Amino acid sequence: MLEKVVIANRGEIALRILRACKELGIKTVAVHSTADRDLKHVLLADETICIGPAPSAKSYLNIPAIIAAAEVTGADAIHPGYGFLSENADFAEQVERSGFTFIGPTADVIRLMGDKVSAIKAMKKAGVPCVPGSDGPVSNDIAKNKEIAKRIGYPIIIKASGGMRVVRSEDALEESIAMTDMVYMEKYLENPRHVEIQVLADTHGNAVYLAERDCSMQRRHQKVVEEAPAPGITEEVRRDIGSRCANACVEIGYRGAGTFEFLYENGEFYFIEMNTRIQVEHPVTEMITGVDLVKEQLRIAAGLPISFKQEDIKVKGHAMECRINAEDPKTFLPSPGKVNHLHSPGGLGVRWDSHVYGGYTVPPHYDSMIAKLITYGDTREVAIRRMQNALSETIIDGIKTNIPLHELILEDENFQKGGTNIHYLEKKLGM
Amino acid sequence: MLEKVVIANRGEIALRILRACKELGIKTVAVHSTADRDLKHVLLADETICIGPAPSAKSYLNIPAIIAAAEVTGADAIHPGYGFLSENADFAEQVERSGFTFIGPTADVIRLMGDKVSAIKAMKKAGVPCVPGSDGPVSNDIAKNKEIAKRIGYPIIIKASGGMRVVRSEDALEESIAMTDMVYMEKYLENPRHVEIQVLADTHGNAVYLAERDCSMQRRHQKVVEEAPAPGITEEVRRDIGSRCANACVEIGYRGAGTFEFLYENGEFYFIEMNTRIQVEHPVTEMITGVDLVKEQLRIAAGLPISFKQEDIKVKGHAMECRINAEDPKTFLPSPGKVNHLHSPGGLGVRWDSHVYGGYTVPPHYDSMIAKLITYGDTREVAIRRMQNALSETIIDGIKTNIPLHELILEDENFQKGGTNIHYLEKKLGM
Ligand SMILES: Nc1ncnc2c1ncn2[C@@H]1O[C@H](COP(=O)(O)OP(=O)(O)CP(=O)(O)O)[C@@H](O)[C@H]1O
Ligand SMILES: Nc1ncnc2c1ncn2[C@@H]1O[C@H](COP(=O)(O)OP(=O)(O)CP(=O)(O)O)[C@@H](O)[C@H]1O
């Protein structure tokens, strides 16, 4: 089975993966760039291998070097984390072709869900609800395009199949479509929330859905605060969309952890993308289900069945996560530098996922996320109050962080009420 | 209701209490000695009041000064934590007599359970199983003492009613009893485990039991590692002893949080003491029940009912706690001093309850406990592996800690098996 895993990533998720491996007695191989020599997980790994210079293109996206590290250590598997090469079908294809287990879905399934209409295509077949659209590429004859558009109802939105332009009136169609590797047409939702379903699927033909997460708080389409379950969603609705996603997994032959992302508006779900990998915000789902998602990833890659059945999963309580970034809380300019003093919060229902430590220098070369603060409570309110308190205890001296932003979000009356849409944060910042 | 609470304690439990207050929007008043000026919770409290010089006798056991602090702030209540004045009936009596709410049981009930035979007396009446004994003070006529002793069966053990000498043969009775403010006789158990039941009781006449904890790993009768639930204990046995403890609460008029400690041997429970207060190791119970014990303490003092019914409580998974002390791991000599670098562990199922921070100096004046590392897993094994991993990530530079001892305990084959008795640790250390 899995005796040694190459952790093809960095930062907090690399540490998350290391922890999961250690608990399973799996040997860890930390591949890192020269600038990541002092990462907490690198310092804890059983074996370390420099795979290149600081720039991502030369290190963490270096496919030849990553596979060479798996080779010279005798690894059985490679965990891509999220981002970087985790949804690169060439990488997964190349990884299997060299005899290693890729901890994720097969290359074909990544290609499938990596192209937008090809994706919406499969979901439709599987019974997964999609946004009313052209259902396929757009013709260039507008006389007919206007029909589909009027059929589904303005506003519509033109979308790149491998990626956006909003159309409000019929008079601006012809042209809006011209402006660009193809494009489809779809209904534009003005007040949607981001709601996503977590799933697991094994090589024994099983598939389970693990409730949902709401990730509506975003800046430039980048998630900032997430929670679970999604407010307003009943156990009945959960079962419906959840079971549809589970079925779709089997229909498309999915394997490992994945997430179906939907736009949620007026009680309707509309599929927009499947992330064929673990997600950053997976911890909130772990808190409310008791499931260890990364451990399940490893078990599944090992050829084992999911370690529980659907009936075993019950939602309990509520969880929140704040992505703590090294950046100016207003300008969002990255703030690299030495952390002179770190104090991380603790206590009942507080979870801290971070690779940062006092004396650690946050490099400029990669993303700005340095920690994920996660809280759990018996209700949504407790989780929020818990988050607020944990944040105020948190010290990170030496650099700027977005903690002040989180504190603003958490004391927001509308966020406290629940159900704010995907536009709300940028709107509050503007105001 | 409760608007402002005076935290009559220090260290980690003071911080625990502060956190619980903050979540409930209760104002906090931190009373501290001069040496505790830099405690994390003092620095977070809404109001601070120096109540005396470093020595405990002059500060944290200073009843006049503590009540004066409650007065000059207008506090409604005083939380005694554990140790210090938490089981001092004079303090609780004096606290109520001055119009403040004492967050704990009434003075009478503390007196009752504070005297050993008077305690065993009540439990017996309530249906709580006690160790076969003289059931009352020992006569001084041995001709009759030998009857009781032979009745219950050697070995027996003589015990101070306000506190021990073991007797193996009849020939050494007369004398063993002479050696001393009274004493009773009791059966001596050679292979017992320490198993204790957590309870809550409110002023609405309700009482609930919250499963049990096993605290068998001890040195000089001081707990080192605790876990929940107690291995080998079935849901059926749990209900039995648990419901007996709940009933006893009502019979004696108990109020707030408390723990019934038993010796557990060959499937039999034998009451030996009730701690009429929160306990250090309460967190492991919180992890397996989802109950916030300190929040319930506060609600109950506020006159509210326990926020859940017995049926709502289900044991799930398993939890472990390691008491991390500033001491030499072999000699157990305290190791006060500056913590130059702190790194606390995190991740799924890891909880860290500590007032320590990088740059903090551990004073000489008080106990050596600086942190409580708590882990949770879906099974006992996962909890243990989780603890082992968390411990290895933990850095505390500047002073000695007992972390090496914990790591020894956790990799012990017998502890891994489960059910080691109260003598096992001192025995392993000896070997
Ligand atoms: N039909 C629709 N109605 C309303 N908003 C839509 C929409 N279609 C797309 N969007 C918006 O565009 C966003 C996604 O854009 P995009 O196609 O570039 O994916 P993305 O890369 O931004 C998210 P990821 O981080 O998973 O890659 C959605 O989050 C949503 O806010
Ligand atoms: N009948 C018995 N059989 C076996 N061991 C016994 C016993 N009675 C007492 N003991 C031992 O003596 C210990 C308790 O001693 P003691 O009466 O001084 O309370 P204590 O102060 O040590 C515990 P606490 O910290 O709650 O005050 C028990 O933990 C147990 O190990």
Side-chain angles (χ1 to χ4, degrees), chain A residues 30-62:
Chain A
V31 290
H32 65 92
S33 71
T34 56
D36 277 337
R37 216 169 278 290
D38 288 337
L39 278 176
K40 177 58 78 174
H41 90 278
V42 167
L43 298 180
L44 296 173
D46 298 311
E47 312 191 272
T48 60
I49 295 187
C50 197
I51 66 187
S56 288
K58 303 309 202 170
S59 47
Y60 297 113
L61 300 181
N62 189 338

Short mmCIF file of all heavy atoms in Angstrom, two decimals, chain A residues 30-62:
data_model
loop_
_atom_site.label_atom_id
_atom_site.label_comp_id
_atom_site.label_asym_id
_atom_site.label_seq_id
_atom_site.Cartn_x
_atom_site.Cartn_y
_atom_site.Cartn_z
N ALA A 30 9.52 15.65 1.45
CA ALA A 30 9.22 17.06 1.21
C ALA A 30 10.05 17.60 0.05
O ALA A 30 11.27 17.77 0.18
CB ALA A 30 9.47 17.87 2.46
N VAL A 31 9.40 17.87 -1.07
CA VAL A 31 10.04 18.56 -2.19
C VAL A 31 9.82 20.06 -2.05
O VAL A 31 8.69 20.52 -1.85
CB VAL A 31 9.52 18.09 -3.56
CG1 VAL A 31 9.98 16.67 -3.85
CG2 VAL A 31 8.00 18.19 -3.64
N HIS A 32 10.90 20.83 -2.15
CA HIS A 32 10.84 22.26 -1.88
C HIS A 32 11.80 23.05 -2.76
O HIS A 32 12.78 22.51 -3.28
CB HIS A 32 11.18 22.53 -0.41
CG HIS A 32 12.58 22.17 -0.04
ND1 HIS A 32 13.62 23.08 -0.09
CD2 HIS A 32 13.13 21.01 0.38
CE1 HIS A 32 14.74 22.49 0.29
NE2 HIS A 32 14.47 21.23 0.58
N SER A 33 11.52 24.34 -2.93
CA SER A 33 12.43 25.23 -3.62
C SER A 33 13.50 25.69 -2.64
O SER A 33 13.46 25.34 -1.46
CB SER A 33 11.69 26.44 -4.18
OG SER A 33 11.27 27.30 -3.14
N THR A 34 14.46 26.48 -3.12
CA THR A 34 15.55 26.94 -2.27
C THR A 34 15.05 27.94 -1.23
O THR A 34 15.61 28.06 -0.14
CB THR A 34 16.68 27.57 -3.11
OG1 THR A 34 16.16 28.63 -3.91
CG2 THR A 34 17.30 26.52 -4.01
N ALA A 35 13.98 28.66 -1.56
CA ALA A 35 13.43 29.69 -0.68
C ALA A 35 12.55 29.09 0.42
O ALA A 35 12.18 29.78 1.37
CB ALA A 35 12.63 30.71 -1.49
N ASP A 36 12.22 27.80 0.29
CA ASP A 36 11.32 27.15 1.24
C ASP A 36 12.05 26.18 2.16
O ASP A 36 11.45 25.31 2.79
CB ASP A 36 10.22 26.41 0.49
CG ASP A 36 9.08 27.32 0.10
OD1 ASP A 36 8.92 28.38 0.74
OD2 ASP A 36 8.35 26.99 -0.86
N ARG A 37 13.37 26.34 2.23
CA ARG A 37 14.22 25.46 3.01
C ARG A 37 13.78 25.42 4.47
O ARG A 37 13.96 24.41 5.14
CB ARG A 37 15.67 25.92 2.90
CG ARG A 37 16.68 24.78 2.86
CD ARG A 37 18.08 25.26 2.49
NE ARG A 37 18.24 25.41 1.04
CZ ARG A 37 18.29 24.40 0.18
NH1 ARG A 37 18.18 23.14 0.60
NH2 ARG A 37 18.44 24.63 -1.12
N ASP A 38 13.21 26.52 4.95
CA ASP A 38 12.87 26.62 6.36
C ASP A 38 11.38 26.45 6.64
O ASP A 38 10.91 26.81 7.72
CB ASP A 38 13.36 27.97 6.92
CG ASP A 38 14.87 28.03 7.07
OD1 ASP A 38 15.51 26.96 7.18
OD2 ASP A 38 15.42 29.15 7.08
N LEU A 39 10.64 25.89 5.69
CA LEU A 39 9.24 25.59 5.93
C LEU A 39 9.11 24.59 7.08
O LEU A 39 9.94 23.69 7.22
CB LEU A 39 8.58 25.02 4.67
CG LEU A 39 8.12 26.05 3.63
CD1 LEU A 39 7.58 25.33 2.41
CD2 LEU A 39 7.06 26.98 4.20
N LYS A 40 8.08 24.77 7.90
CA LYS A 40 7.88 23.92 9.06
C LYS A 40 7.78 22.45 8.67
O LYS A 40 8.34 21.59 9.33
CB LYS A 40 6.62 24.35 9.83
CG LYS A 40 6.28 23.48 11.04
CD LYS A 40 7.42 23.42 12.06
CE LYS A 40 7.47 24.68 12.92
NZ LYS A 40 8.49 24.56 14.00
N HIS A 41 7.07 22.16 7.58
CA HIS A 41 6.86 20.77 7.18
C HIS A 41 8.12 20.15 6.59
O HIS A 41 8.39 18.97 6.80
CB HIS A 41 5.70 20.65 6.19
CG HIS A 41 6.11 20.77 4.76
ND1 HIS A 41 6.31 21.98 4.14
CD2 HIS A 41 6.33 19.82 3.81
CE1 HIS A 41 6.66 21.78 2.88
NE2 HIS A 41 6.67 20.48 2.65
N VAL A 42 8.90 20.95 5.87
CA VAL A 42 10.20 20.51 5.38
C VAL A 42 11.08 20.08 6.55
O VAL A 42 11.75 19.05 6.49
CB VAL A 42 10.91 21.62 4.59
CG1 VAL A 42 12.38 21.28 4.35
CG2 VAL A 42 10.20 21.86 3.27
N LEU A 43 11.06 20.87 7.61
CA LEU A 43 11.87 20.59 8.79
C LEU A 43 11.38 19.35 9.56
O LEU A 43 12.12 18.79 10.36
CB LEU A 43 11.88 21.80 9.73
CG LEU A 43 12.50 23.08 9.15
CD1 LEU A 43 12.45 24.22 10.16
CD2 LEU A 43 13.92 22.84 8.69
N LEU A 44 10.15 18.94 9.30
CA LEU A 44 9.56 17.78 9.98
C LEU A 44 9.59 16.52 9.11
O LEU A 44 9.45 15.41 9.61
CB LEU A 44 8.12 18.08 10.38
CG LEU A 44 7.91 19.20 11.41
CD1 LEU A 44 6.42 19.49 11.57
CD2 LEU A 44 8.54 18.84 12.74
N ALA A 45 9.77 16.70 7.80
CA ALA A 45 9.70 15.58 6.86
C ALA A 45 10.83 14.58 7.10
O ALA A 45 11.89 14.93 7.61
CB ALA A 45 9.75 16.09 5.44
N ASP A 46 10.57 13.33 6.73
CA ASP A 46 11.56 12.26 6.86
C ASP A 46 12.70 12.46 5.87
O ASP A 46 13.86 12.26 6.20
CB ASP A 46 10.91 10.90 6.65
CG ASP A 46 9.82 10.60 7.67
OD1 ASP A 46 10.08 10.77 8.88
OD2 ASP A 46 8.71 10.21 7.26
N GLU A 47 12.34 12.86 4.65
CA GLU A 47 13.33 13.17 3.62
C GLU A 47 12.99 14.49 2.94
O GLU A 47 11.82 14.82 2.76
CB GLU A 47 13.39 12.06 2.57
CG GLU A 47 13.48 10.66 3.14
CD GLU A 47 13.79 9.62 2.08
OE1 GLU A 47 12.84 9.09 1.47
OE2 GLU A 47 14.99 9.34 1.87
N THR A 48 14.02 15.24 2.56
CA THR A 48 13.84 16.50 1.85
C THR A 48 14.63 16.50 0.54
O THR A 48 15.72 15.93 0.47
CB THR A 48 14.29 17.70 2.70
OG1 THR A 48 15.68 17.57 3.03
CG2 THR A 48 13.46 17.79 3.98
N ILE A 49 14.08 17.14 -0.48
CA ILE A 49 14.74 17.22 -1.78
C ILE A 49 14.47 18.56 -2.45
O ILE A 49 13.33 18.88 -2.81
CB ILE A 49 14.26 16.10 -2.72
CG1 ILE A 49 14.68 14.73 -2.17
CG2 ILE A 49 14.83 16.31 -4.12
CD1 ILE A 49 14.40 13.57 -3.10
N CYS A 50 15.52 19.36 -2.61
CA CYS A 50 15.42 20.62 -3.33
C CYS A 50 15.13 20.34 -4.80
O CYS A 50 15.90 19.64 -5.46
CB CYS A 50 16.71 21.42 -3.20
SG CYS A 50 16.55 23.16 -3.61
N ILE A 51 14.02 20.87 -5.30
CA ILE A 51 13.61 20.62 -6.68
C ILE A 51 13.81 21.82 -7.60
O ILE A 51 13.48 21.74 -8.79
CB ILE A 51 12.13 20.19 -6.77
CG1 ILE A 51 11.21 21.34 -6.35
CG2 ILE A 51 11.89 18.95 -5.93
CD1 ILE A 51 9.73 20.97 -6.25
N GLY A 52 14.33 22.92 -7.07
CA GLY A 52 14.61 24.07 -7.90
C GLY A 52 14.72 25.38 -7.15
O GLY A 52 14.59 25.42 -5.93
N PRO A 53 14.96 26.47 -7.90
CA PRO A 53 15.06 27.83 -7.36
C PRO A 53 13.69 28.37 -6.95
O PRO A 53 12.69 27.68 -7.14
CB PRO A 53 15.64 28.62 -8.54
CG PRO A 53 15.17 27.90 -9.74
CD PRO A 53 15.08 26.45 -9.36
N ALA A 54 13.65 29.57 -6.39
CA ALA A 54 12.45 30.08 -5.74
C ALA A 54 11.22 30.16 -6.64
O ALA A 54 10.13 29.75 -6.24
CB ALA A 54 12.72 31.43 -5.09
N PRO A 55 11.37 30.69 -7.87
CA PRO A 55 10.18 30.88 -8.70
C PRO A 55 9.40 29.58 -8.92
O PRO A 55 9.99 28.55 -9.22
CB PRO A 55 10.75 31.40 -10.02
CG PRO A 55 12.08 31.98 -9.67
CD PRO A 55 12.60 31.12 -8.55
N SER A 56 8.08 29.65 -8.78
CA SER A 56 7.21 28.48 -8.88
C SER A 56 7.43 27.70 -10.17
O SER A 56 7.48 26.47 -10.16
CB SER A 56 5.74 28.90 -8.80
OG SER A 56 5.40 29.29 -7.49
N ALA A 57 7.57 28.42 -11.28
CA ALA A 57 7.75 27.80 -12.59
C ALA A 57 8.95 26.86 -12.59
O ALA A 57 8.98 25.89 -13.35
CB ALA A 57 7.91 28.87 -13.66
N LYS A 58 9.93 27.15 -11.74
CA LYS A 58 11.18 26.41 -11.74
C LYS A 58 11.24 25.34 -10.66
O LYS A 58 12.15 24.51 -10.65
CB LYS A 58 12.35 27.38 -11.56
CG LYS A 58 12.40 28.48 -12.61
CD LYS A 58 12.33 27.88 -14.00
CE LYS A 58 12.90 28.82 -15.05
NZ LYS A 58 13.05 28.14 -16.36
N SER A 59 10.27 25.35 -9.75
CA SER A 59 10.28 24.43 -8.63
C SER A 59 8.98 23.63 -8.52
O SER A 59 8.93 22.46 -8.92
CB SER A 59 10.52 25.20 -7.33
OG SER A 59 9.69 26.35 -7.26
N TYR A 60 7.94 24.25 -7.99
CA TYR A 60 6.70 23.54 -7.67
C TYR A 60 5.86 23.21 -8.91
O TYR A 60 4.94 22.39 -8.83
CB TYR A 60 5.88 24.34 -6.67
CG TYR A 60 6.57 24.52 -5.33
CD1 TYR A 60 6.98 25.77 -4.90
CD2 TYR A 60 6.82 23.43 -4.51
CE1 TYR A 60 7.62 25.93 -3.68
CE2 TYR A 60 7.45 23.58 -3.28
CZ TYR A 60 7.86 24.84 -2.88
OH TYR A 60 8.48 25.01 -1.67
N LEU A 61 6.17 23.83 -10.04
CA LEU A 61 5.53 23.49 -11.30
C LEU A 61 6.50 22.71 -12.19
O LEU A 61 6.23 22.49 -13.37
CB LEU A 61 5.03 24.74 -12.03
CG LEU A 61 4.00 25.60 -11.29
CD1 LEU A 61 3.61 26.79 -12.15
CD2 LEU A 61 2.77 24.79 -10.92
N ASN A 62 7.63 22.31 -11.62
CA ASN A 62 8.65 21.56 -12.35
C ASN A 62 8.34 20.07 -12.35
O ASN A 62 8.76 19.34 -11.46
CB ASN A 62 10.02 21.81 -11.72
CG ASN A 62 11.16 21.25 -12.55
OD1 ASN A 62 10.97 20.34 -13.36
ND2 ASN A 62 12.36 21.78 -12.35
#
